Amino acid sequence: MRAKWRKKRMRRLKRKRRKMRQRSK
Amino acid sequence: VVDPFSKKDWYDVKAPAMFNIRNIGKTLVTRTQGTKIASDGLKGRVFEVSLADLQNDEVAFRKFKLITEDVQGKNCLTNFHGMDLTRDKMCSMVKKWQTMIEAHVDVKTTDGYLLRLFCVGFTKKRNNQIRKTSYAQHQQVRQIRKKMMEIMTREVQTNDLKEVVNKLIPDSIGKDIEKACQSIYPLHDVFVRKVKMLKKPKFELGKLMELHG
Amino acid sequence: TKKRRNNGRAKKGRGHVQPIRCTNCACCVPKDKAIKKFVIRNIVEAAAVRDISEVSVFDAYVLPKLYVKLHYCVSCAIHSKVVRNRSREARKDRTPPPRFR
Amino acid sequence: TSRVQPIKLARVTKVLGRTGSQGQCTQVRVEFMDDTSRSIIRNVKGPVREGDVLTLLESEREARRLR
Amino acid sequence: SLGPQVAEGENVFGVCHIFASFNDTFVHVTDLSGKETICRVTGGMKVKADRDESSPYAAMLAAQDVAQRCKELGITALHIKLRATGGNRTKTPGPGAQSALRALARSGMKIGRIEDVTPIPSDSTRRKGGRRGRRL
RNA sequence: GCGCAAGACGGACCAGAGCGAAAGCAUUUGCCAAGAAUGUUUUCAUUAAUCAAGAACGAAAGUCGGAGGUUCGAAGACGAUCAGAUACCGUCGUAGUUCCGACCAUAAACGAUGCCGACCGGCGAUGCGGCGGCGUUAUUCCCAUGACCCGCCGGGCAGCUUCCGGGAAACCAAAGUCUUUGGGUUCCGGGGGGAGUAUGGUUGCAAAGCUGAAACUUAAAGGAAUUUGGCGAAGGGCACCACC
Ligand SMILES: [Zn+2]
């Protein structure tokens, strides 16, 4: 895990959390 | 499979009488049978020949393009198709710490033949020069190119094909270019790199016959 | 740390130059960074010149030359042993390598 | 093949350094006798001096480096 | 092959194109026009494994075969047109061009003008491969 | 080998050369507009410097709607490689790469070095503008212009050298004039991880951009340089406990 792929993984996790938050309103 | 070269006749290709050497070499074609007439295979053929093989006491870094037009019998009478330069001098004249000037024109001769002349010019380093840059300003390059265009426009509009290809055998066009651009900036290697034709008029038998003497 | 006075290239006030391609590789390298080599070659090599001049019809026939320009990525240049690593004190030598023959 | 090549014999003149991956062969300047100025460089293994001749089945190959 | 010519007065001139690459050599022979050929022998016709196609021996064998066929036909002199792969790929000629030219010289023919016709471009087309090139 | 048609690009000339605030800019020519430097015994008289709020531009990739798609080529389809290889490699190939119109404002956007101004050594050069001078050339006389040579001035991209000086050192003529500590001014950091993360606001069609914590855990994480060290790093030699 270098910084760029960690950033990509964090972005994917943020997308999944945003999607579950907007579907769990 | 039958031998395919049992039906091949060695023809003769002839240079026009404006050159010294008339005999260029020999080509071949299949005999006439039905849809393949033997004169058609020599209708469009371009010969990349050298200048020292064309003349005697001349240089060997220039090439000419000769195209056949018609055959009378066992003879392939040729005509001017273009002028090129050998690639060796083309990548040997270019050097670092010097600039280039190139001009291209769409001029038409006094007959129905239209030419396209390309030119290249380089940089002369003086004998007492210590500087290794030998560059030039942009407006000097524009003025040298303008001299090139007016020289190439002036010298061929009053002449026909025979006179311009007679002038192409020496470097008199290049000499006039390098003599016109003397008070602007010196040039050391001026040559006509390429000659191309765009417009081909209706073929005339008498003009080609008088072109061969 | 800072290895060189420059950054291994030859831009001082530009910020961007057009990219070129390597010869052995297909790597996109900037033009002023790549190690150029304008090699001067001819057709025949050392001993075929006698056979060519014996078979050439024209007497005193001058032989042509081949002029190409070669652009190298630095990894493909070092792997081809055209440039070698130097010491820290002798790195600051911009003089070209000496030619003899 | 459709052709037979006559066996050509030639005399070595000068011995260069030894080549090869394991250094099993030598490099010499091989000079013919049909013309006295025709001298090529080939690869030969074994103990080679200056003065002995070689038997050349294939007389138009030059020498070879480490590869 | 036949005609009213004489073998003592003059010599028959043709133009031979030598395509040399790093995979194969094309020892081609055309007429003085260049439009119509005589015989086309390639370096893959002699060897069986393609790894020997880039060998100088295959180019020598192909050049000897096309030269003996041409001097059986009656062409004595040749003009050299050496050409590499060209384009954006490679400017350096292949390893079989020297061997092919030497085999044409030693076959008994005659050699005239020599020039290179490698198609160098005016920086036209994107090269094969990505930004990082080939990794090996 | 002769021609046609389409799209893309501008090789050699091309350099530690130029311009631009930056991102960037290379076929010839024509048109429009702007700008630095140089020259001035011209013009106004402090109109100046840095900057919350706000505003313009901003590589490539990404989105929407068109025309067009030569080559290259994410995803995908195979062949080898390998214990595994949906990786390096090889052949095809959809978006994309090209142009227009509407978005986002992200880079190792890096000279990893804010802007203005004064002082502080030397030397060879380069680009521009101006000044002065023995000579050669545009064929022989004169003058002015271009082209060389010899020097000077101003601005700039740089280079070599130095025990000015500074620094932890690598190094820097600025990163100097700093305890002998104060020229003016904007932004910004207080051990490492959590974390550029969660919530809130704002912006965006979307992807995401700006603002930005806390609980908890940890005694080190780091910067420069020195000596055997290991390199499937390079350059020279040696050994039948190595090979041929
Ligand atoms: Zn490469």
mmCIF file of C-alpha atoms (C1' of nucleotides) in Angstrom, chain B residues 44 46 65 81 90 94-100 102 104 126 128-131 133-135 137-138 140 142 145 149 179 182-186, chain F residues 1-4 11-17 27-31 125-129 134-139 144-150:
data_model
loop_
_atom_site.group_PDB
_atom_site.id
_atom_site.type_symbol
_atom_site.label_atom_id
_atom_site.label_comp_id
_atom_site.label_asym_id
_atom_site.label_seq_id
_atom_site.Cartn_x
_atom_site.Cartn_y
_atom_site.Cartn_z
ATOM 1 C CA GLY B 44 2.968 4.639 -67.013
ATOM 2 C CA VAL B 46 8.807 6.141 -63.867
ATOM 3 C CA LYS B 65 12.574 11.140 -63.072
ATOM 4 C CA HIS B 81 8.683 13.796 -64.743
ATOM 5 C CA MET B 90 20.098 15.508 -47.930
ATOM 6 C CA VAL B 94 22.152 19.428 -42.298
ATOM 7 C CA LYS B 95 24.339 20.242 -39.289
ATOM 8 C CA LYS B 96 23.962 21.683 -35.816
ATOM 9 C CA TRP B 97 24.633 25.376 -35.016
ATOM 10 C CA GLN B 98 23.101 26.557 -38.311
ATOM 11 C CA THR B 99 19.636 27.375 -39.638
ATOM 12 C CA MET B 100 17.550 26.395 -42.671
ATOM 13 C CA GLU B 102 12.855 26.413 -47.290
ATOM 14 C CA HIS B 104 7.871 26.096 -52.107
ATOM 15 C CA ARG B 126 33.127 32.972 -42.027
ATOM 16 C CA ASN B 128 37.835 34.674 -39.361
ATOM 17 C CA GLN B 129 34.884 33.696 -37.147
ATOM 18 C CA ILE B 130 35.430 32.684 -33.532
ATOM 19 C CA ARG B 131 31.728 32.395 -32.570
ATOM 20 C CA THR B 133 26.599 29.916 -32.956
ATOM 21 C CA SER B 134 26.249 31.201 -36.569
ATOM 22 C CA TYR B 135 22.520 31.815 -36.158
ATOM 23 C CA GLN B 137 17.420 36.773 -36.993
ATOM 24 C CA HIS B 138 13.931 35.792 -38.116
ATOM 25 C CA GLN B 140 16.654 37.968 -42.245
ATOM 26 C CA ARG B 142 12.009 35.986 -44.153
ATOM 27 C CA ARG B 145 12.965 33.390 -48.391
ATOM 28 C CA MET B 149 10.455 33.180 -54.101
ATOM 29 C CA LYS B 179 24.197 35.648 -55.174
ATOM 30 C CA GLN B 182 24.723 38.146 -50.213
ATOM 31 C CA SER B 183 24.044 41.466 -48.460
ATOM 32 C CA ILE B 184 21.496 39.891 -46.084
ATOM 33 C CA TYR B 185 23.366 36.889 -44.662
ATOM 34 C CA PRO B 186 25.856 34.502 -46.354
ATOM 35 C "C1'" G F 1 5.649 0.107 -59.187
ATOM 36 C "C1'" C F 2 1.765 3.860 -60.551
ATOM 37 C "C1'" G F 3 -2.377 6.739 -58.385
ATOM 38 C "C1'" C F 4 -6.629 7.899 -55.097
ATOM 39 C "C1'" G F 11 11.517 14.723 -37.792
ATOM 40 C "C1'" A F 12 16.891 16.249 -39.098
ATOM 41 C "C1'" C F 13 17.697 22.266 -38.316
ATOM 42 C "C1'" C F 14 16.431 21.980 -32.090
ATOM 43 C "C1'" A F 15 21.117 24.157 -28.150
ATOM 44 C "C1'" G F 16 21.612 23.911 -20.216
ATOM 45 C "C1'" A F 17 18.653 29.066 -27.087
ATOM 46 C "C1'" U F 27 5.170 23.859 -42.036
ATOM 47 C "C1'" U F 28 5.138 28.855 -45.463
ATOM 48 C "C1'" U F 29 2.240 33.312 -45.917
ATOM 49 C "C1'" G F 30 -1.750 37.163 -44.910
ATOM 50 C "C1'" C F 31 -4.774 40.026 -41.061
ATOM 51 C "C1'" A F 125 30.574 33.100 -22.751
ATOM 52 C "C1'" U F 126 25.117 33.419 -24.694
ATOM 53 C "C1'" G F 127 20.182 36.248 -26.504
ATOM 54 C "C1'" C F 128 18.319 41.341 -27.262
ATOM 55 C "C1'" G F 129 18.782 46.889 -27.895
ATOM 56 C "C1'" C F 134 42.322 48.623 -36.970
ATOM 57 C "C1'" G F 135 40.705 45.428 -40.776
ATOM 58 C "C1'" U F 136 37.903 41.349 -44.856
ATOM 59 C "C1'" U F 137 33.135 40.592 -47.699
ATOM 60 C "C1'" A F 138 28.002 42.246 -50.584
ATOM 61 C "C1'" U F 139 34.145 41.954 -56.356
ATOM 62 C "C1'" A F 144 24.997 53.980 -44.747
ATOM 63 C "C1'" U F 145 23.301 49.180 -43.987
ATOM 64 C "C1'" G F 146 23.611 43.666 -43.312
ATOM 65 C "C1'" A F 147 27.921 39.517 -42.439
ATOM 66 C "C1'" C F 148 32.991 38.733 -39.202
ATOM 67 C "C1'" C F 149 36.604 40.685 -35.454
ATOM 68 C "C1'" C F 150 37.762 44.095 -30.809
#
